[PDB]
Subunit: 424 residues, 4 copies
C-alpha cells in the first residue's frame, strides 16, 4: 500500500532493485569461480563492465520464457558475448532468487534495526523526562495506585530493547544464502564456490539446502517482525486511551488553529490496524515451511506479498511511532489531577491496613473504610475529610498519621532503582 | 485433548501442580523477606511445615471468593496461624500467577528441549546410516536429479538443530517473574525481596513490570513452539509422500500379520494436523500483547487453553516423530530403482551439455535430446539405448563417454563435505 | 477448559455421548436395510435392545485395535449375537464418525441458536428500556454528538439478529451425513440405504462424498461461530470502556458490601479473551479443507480440539453476555452529565453553521467558534456563555436562537424511526 | 501484487475508480434531497455536468487537508459553483467511504460470482466427459478401491456449487450502505434521504449504523472468499499429486517442444500459495469488528490491503483454475493401469468376504488373504493367480466366482445415481 511506503525501505523492493541483487549474486559466483582458478582470469571484470540492468528487456524476454531468472540470464547473456559460458554456471534459479532475498531481508532488517534503536533512544529520553511525574496506574481500566508516567514509558522502552535483541537474532537467521544447484547437493556447482561467493555478499552458506533455503528461517524473521508490531500496538492503544475526552493525559502530534475538543488519536488508530496486518502475515509464513520434497513453489506467491509488505509496514510503524512519542503533548497537571478523580479513594488500602495495625481486624477496618468510601463516592466531600470526621477513626489515628497515608510519595519511592536497572 | 497427553509434561499442568507452584513462589518471598531481616526469623520454616496443598479446600473457598489466588491465600492462611501476617505480604495476585507460569513455561521448555535434543540424536544416526544411499531428488513432485537419502535426513537434522537453539532462547525469554505488587512499582513489596525471591526460583526479575509480566515474552515462546511444530510437519509430509503406493520408499512404524498393501501413514497425518493447532495458538498469543494500561485480564482465558495445550501437543509431536524416524522402514532398493523410473531421463541435462561441449549449439543438442526423450517416454526402451542408436550422437561421443553420463556418482560426490559441516 | 463448560452443551461432548451418536448412526443404517428388505425383519429392534454403551470396554478393545470405530463395532458385536452379521454392514469408519459429528454440530448449533435468540430478546428489552436515554456518541474515543443509549444497544441487537440468521445457515450447512462406504461411491452400501438412514437422523446425504464429508462445511460453520464471538467482543469492549473510572456509565453485574471504586469489568475482559480463541480456530479449520485425494486423517486431530472447544466456548460467551446485558447497571444521570463534560463544545458544529447561515463565510465562523472553544477549553466558563458575551455573535443571532442550538432534542429526533425498522 | 491482477477486477481498485464511486454516492444523495424537495430542482444535473474526477487535484488538496474525503469534497466544490451548498450536505466522511466500499464489494462479488459460475460449467463438462473413467480411489495416499475420475471431478463441482450459493449470500451481506451522518442517528441528514439515495445505488440502508457500517458484514464476506479459495486449493493439491512422476494421471496446461519428463504443476503450486494469503486475510477482518464506540479508524488501514487484495487474488485463482481444469490433459489409460499397480490387491476385501461367505470365519479368511497378499507384494505374480493356485481357495470357490471379484464394474455401479442428484 503506497501510502505507507517510505524511503530507504521502499527503494529496496522495486523491480530495478531485485535485478540489481540478482546481478550481484551472479557476479559474486563468477568472482569465486575465477578466484579458485575454475574459469579464466578476466571474466568477472568483463561481465561487470558489460552487464547492465534493463528491466524492460528482461520483462520482454520473460513474456516468451515465463520464467523470471531464465529471462534475466538470457538478457544478460545478450550483453556479455562469449563470457555467457561462465555466467550462471551450474546454478539453479533459486540459488539466485533465495540468495537475493536473503540480501534483501538482511538489508531491510538493518534498516528496521537502525530505526528501532532510534525509537529506543526517544523512549529513554521521554521516560527520563517524566521520571518523577505522578499519574494513576490503571488495572481493568479502573484507577488502582499512583505510579510515575516515566515508569510507564520505561516499560515501552524495555519492550523495544527486547525487540532490538530479537531483530538482531532474526537478521542472523536470514543471513544464509545458497549456491548449491538443482537439488542442493553441489552436483553442478562446487561448495567451494558457494562458500566464497556468499562470503563476498556478507552471507553464510545454508549448511544443507535443497533446491531452496529452508523456510523456517523466513518464518522466524516474520514472527519476530509481528512481535515488534504488537509492542507498538500496545503503545498506540495506551495513547488512544490517554487521549480520550474523559482522560486528556496525552495528545498525539498533529497537522500544524485546530479545535481543542476534536483532537483524535488517528495516527495511533492507524498503527493498531497495521499491527493486525503484521500478525496476519505470520500464519502463511508458517504454512510455507512444509514444502514438498526438495521444494514446491507455493511459497513464492506468498512471499511476493509478505516480504515487501511486512518490512515496509513495520518500517512505517517504527518511524511513525517514534515521531508520536517524540512530539506528543504530555499533560502533567491533568495526570496529577486525575489521581484525585475518586477524591482520595486510591489510598483506601493504606487506610484499611492502618486501621488493622491500630488493633482492628480485617472485617472491622473494611466496614469503616467501605462506609466512608460510599459516602465519598456519592457526594462531593473527599475521603480524608469523611475519615477525619469518623469517631472510630479519631480514636485510632492522629490527624498527621491519617494525612500521611494520602502521600503520593509512598508509591514513587522505588522508581530510581527501576531506572538504574537500565544504566546496566 | 487427553489422548495426546504424555508424562512428564502432563503432570506439569494439573491443578495440584499449579497450587504447588503458587506455594513455591510464596515461600520464596517469605524466605527473601526473612533473609533481609524484614520479617521475624523462623517464619518461613513454620509456614513450610504447616502449609499443605488441599485442592478441594481451595476450590471450595473460591466458590465464595470467585478469585483463585485469594482463595489459595485464605486456605493456606487457615493452616499457618499467626504466620499469615507475613504470607503474601504486599503481593498482588499476578505476582504469584505470572511467576508460577514462568516456572511452568521454563520447566515445560526444558522437557521439550531434552526431547528435541534426543530427536536430533536420532536424526543424526539415521542421516549417517543412509549417507551413501541414492534416491531421486524431487522438485514440484517431479523427478529432478539423484541425491542421497542421508542428505535428505541431514536437512531435517539441520532444522531441528536450529530449533534447539531457538528453544534455548525462548526458555531464556520466559525466565522472568515479577514480585512487584499491584501496579509493578514496588510500593507494597521491596525490589530487594523480588530479586532474592526470584533468584531462589531460578528466575530473573522483569526489569519493569506492570501488574503483569509483559506478554511479548509469552508470544515469543509460543511463536517459537509453532516453528518447531512446522519443521516436524515438514518431515511428516515427506514421510506421507514417500509411503504412498506409487513410491513405497519408507514406511512409518506400526501396530505389531498386517496387510502389506494397506500400510497408511496415519501417525504422520496426525502430526500434520497437530502442527495446524500449534500455529493456530500464535495469533491469540500475539493479540494478548496489547493489554490496557497496567493490565486487563483478557489474556488469562486464552492462556488457560494455550499454555498447557501448546506445550503438551508439541511434546507429543517431538516424542512421536522421534519414534517414527527411529523405527521407520527405509526401502533402499526401491529408492535406487525409483531413480530409473523415467528410464534414464534424469541424466538428460548431462547428455544435452555433452552434445554442446562436443560442438553443437544449445538448440541442436536440445532437439536431439528431446527427440530421444519422447521416444523413451512413450516406449519401453531406455534413454541410453536410444542415444546409442542415434547417428548424430554416435558421431560426437564414444560409448564409454555416453555411459559415464549415467553415473549416479556424479551427483553424490560432495555429500561428505556437507556432513563435515556438522562435525563442527 | 472445564471452567468455561456449561450444561447442555458440555453433555454433548463426553465420550459416552460420542458412542451414543455412533450407535444412533448404526441403528439408522440397520433400520434402513431392514425397511428395504435387505436384512431380516426384527434385527434393528434386537440390536437396539442389546447394544449398550460401555465406555470402558470400547476403550479396552481400542488398546488392542488402535482404531476407535473398529473397537466400538467389535464391542457392540459381543453383545448382539448373530445380528453382528448385519451391523456396520458395508460401512467405512468415517460413515459413522462424520455422520455422528454432523449430529453433534447440528445439536450444538440448535443449543447455540436458542441461547442467541434469548440474547436478542434481552437486547431488545434493554434497547427499548433506554430508548430515549441521552448519551454522548464517541468517535476515536472523543466526544462527537449526542445520541441515545438505547440506539447503541439496538446496534448490538441488530448484529445479534444478523448472527441468528447466519447460525441458521451454518446449521443447514452441517446437516449433511454420509453412508457411502470406503471411497464414497456406494460400492459396498447402497445409496437407498444412505438416503433412508440419514432421513431417520434428520440429516441429508452429501450429494457426492469421498471417504469423508467435505470439510468446507465445517469451516463455514466455525467461521460463522467466530463472527458471532467477535460481535460479543464488540459489546464486551464497549462495556469495558463505559465502566472505566473516568466514564462510569455502566457496571457489569458482580459478586453479591463491595467497594464502590473497585468495580472491574472482569467478565467482559474474559469475553474479549475467549473471542480471540474462537477466531484462532478458523485458520486450522480452513487448512483442513485441502485433504489428499479421497481423504487423509490430518483433520481428525484438529477437530478433536475445535468441535467441542468452539461450540462450548461460544455457548459460554452467549449465556454470559446475556446475563451481563440483562443485569448490568446503567447510570443514566451520569450519561447525561457526560454530554456536558466539554461544557457545550459538542454543539460547536451547529454554532458554526448558524454563523454561516447568518451571512458569514466558513473561515470567519470557524475563527469565532475556535476562539470561543479555546477559551471554554482552558477555563470553567461554558461555551454558550462565551458565545452570549461575544459581540460578533450578538449582532448575528438572538439569545433564543443561540440557546436552541444547545438542545439535545435535535440529535434524538430520528431515534423512533430507527426502532420502527425492527418492529412487527 | 500486480502480477496476479486481471481486468475487470483490477479496474475496480484504482484511485480513479474510488473517486468515481465517491462521486456516485454524493450524486445519489443530492438526487434524493432534490426529489424530496429539500434542495432546488436542477442541482443534481448541474453537479453531474460539472463534477469531473481529477485525481491529481484531489491528491494535492489532501496534502493540505490530510483527510481524503474532505479533499475530494473541496476539489469537487471548486468545479460546481454555488451548488457546493447542496453537495455533501449533512454527511460524515464514512457515509461516502463505507457506501462506496459497499458498491465496490458488491461489484467485485458479482465479477467473482460470474467467474465462479463459469468454473462450475467447466467442472460439470469435465466430470461428465470422464463420468465412467476408472481410476483408483486413494485414502492416506494409499490405493483403496476403484472409483471414477468423473466422480472425483463432480466432488469439485459440488463444492464450487456450494460456493456459488455462499458467494450470493456474501454479496447480500455487503449490499448495505449508510447515509446517516456523524454518529449514525440522522441528526444532520434525514433517513428518507438515505433510503432514497441508497435505493438509486442498488443498496439497502444499514438498519442501525454508527459512524460506520458494522464490520461483521465485511468479515462474513472475506471469510466466505477464503472458503472459496480453500476449495480451489483442494483441487490444486489433487492435480499436484496426480502430476507427480510416479502417478502421471493428469498434466496441467503449459507454455506451448517441451521435455516430456519435466512437466511441473507450477500453476497449481501457485494456487496453493495464493489460498494461504486468502485465509491470512480472515483474522484481521475479524479483529476489525470490535471498533471502539461509534467507531475508530483502525479498520481503514487493514481494508486498504484486504479489500482490493482478497478480491483480486480470488478472481485470479478462479479464472486460472478454470483454465487448468478446462485444458488439463487427462491420461485415462494410465489411470486404468494404476488400478493394477498392486497386482489385484485392491480387490482383497471382496476375496476376504467371499471366503467368509463360503463358510470360513473372519480369521481363517484373513490368514488366507494375507498369505497370498504377501506373496503377491514380494513378487511379480498377480494376486488372482496365487489365489487360483491356492488349494484352500480351490475347494471353496469356482474360477468364475473368483474372477468376478476382480471386476471394476462392482465399484462403478452407482456412479449414474450420484450424477442424477445434480441433474434438472
Amino acid at each position: 500500500v503506497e501510502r505507507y511506503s517510505l524511503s530507504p525501505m521502499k527503494d529496496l523492493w522495486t523491480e530495478e532493485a531485485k535485478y540489481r541483487r540478482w546481478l550481484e549474486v551472479e557476479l559474486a559466483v563468477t568472482r569465486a569461480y575465477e578466484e579458485l582458478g575454475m574459469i579464466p582470469k578476466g571474466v568477472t571484470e568483463r561481465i561487470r563492465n558489460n552487464a547492465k540492468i534493463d528491466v524492460e528487456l528482461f520483462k520482454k524476454i520473460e513474456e516468451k520464457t515465463n520464467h523470471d531468472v531464465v529471462a534475466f540470464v538470457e538478457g544478460i547473456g545478450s550483453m556479455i558475448g562469449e563470457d555467457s559460458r561462465f555466467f550462471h554456471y551450474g546454478l539453479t534459479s533459486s540459488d539466485v532468487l533465495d540468495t537475493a532475498n536473503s540480501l534483501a531481508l538482511v538489508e531491510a532488517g538493518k534498516i528496521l534495526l537502525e530505526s528501532l534503536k532510534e525509537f529506543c533512544d526517544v523512549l529513554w529520553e521521554v521516560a527520563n523526562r517524566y521520571k518523577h511525574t505522578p499519574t494513576i496506574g490503571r488495572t481493568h481500566g479502573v484507577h488502582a495506585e499512583p505510579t510515575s508516567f516515566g515508569l510507564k514509558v520505561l516499560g515501552w522502552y524495555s519492550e523495544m530493547k527486547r525487540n532490538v535483541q530479537r531483530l538482531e537474532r532474526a537478521i542472523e537467521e536470514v543471513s544464509y544464502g545458497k549456491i548449491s544447484g538443482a537439488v542442493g547437493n553441489y552436483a553442478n556447482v562446487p561448495p567451494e564456490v558457494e562458500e566464497k561467493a556468499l562470503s563476498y555478499l556478507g552471507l553464510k552458506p545454508e549448511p544443507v539446502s535443497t533446491q531452496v533455503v529452508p523456510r523456517d528461517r523466513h518464518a522466524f524473521y516474520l514472527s519476530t517482525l509481528a512481535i515488534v508490531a504488537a509492542g507498538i500496538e500496545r503503545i498506540a492503544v495506551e495513547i488512544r486511551h490517554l487521549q480520550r475526552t474523559e482522560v486528556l493525559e496525552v495528545e498525539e502530534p498533529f497537522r500544524k488553529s485546530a479545535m481543542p475538543h476534536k483532537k483524535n488519536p488517528i495516527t495511533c488508530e492507524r498503527l493498531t490496524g497495521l499491527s493486525r496486518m503484521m500478525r496476519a502475515y505470520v500464519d502463511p509464513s508458517l504454512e510455507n515451511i512444509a514444502l514438498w520434497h526438495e521444494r514446491d513453489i507455493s511459497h513464492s506467491s506468498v512471499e511476493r506479498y509478505v516480504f515487501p509488505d511486512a518490512t515496509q509496514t513495520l518500517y512505517y510503524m517504527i518511524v511513525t511511532a517514534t515521531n508520536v512519542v517524540r512530539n506528543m503533548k504530555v499533560n502533567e497537571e491533568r495526570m496529577k489531577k486525575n489521581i484525585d478523580l475518586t477524591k482520595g479513594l486510591v489510598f483506601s488500602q493504606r487506610v484499611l491496613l492502618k486501621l488493622i495495625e491500630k488493633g482492628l481486624t480485617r472485617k472491622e477496618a473494611y466496614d469503616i473504610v467501605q462506609r466512608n468510601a460510599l459516602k465519598t463516592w456519592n457526594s462531593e466531600k473527599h475521603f480524608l475529610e469523611y475519615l477525619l470526621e469518623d469517631e472510630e477513626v479519631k480514636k485510632l489515628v492522629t490527624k498527621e498519621e491519617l494525612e500521611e497515608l494520602f502521600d503520593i510519595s509512598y508509591y514513587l519511592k522505588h522508581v530510581d532503582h527501576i531506572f538504574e536497572r537500565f544504566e546496566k
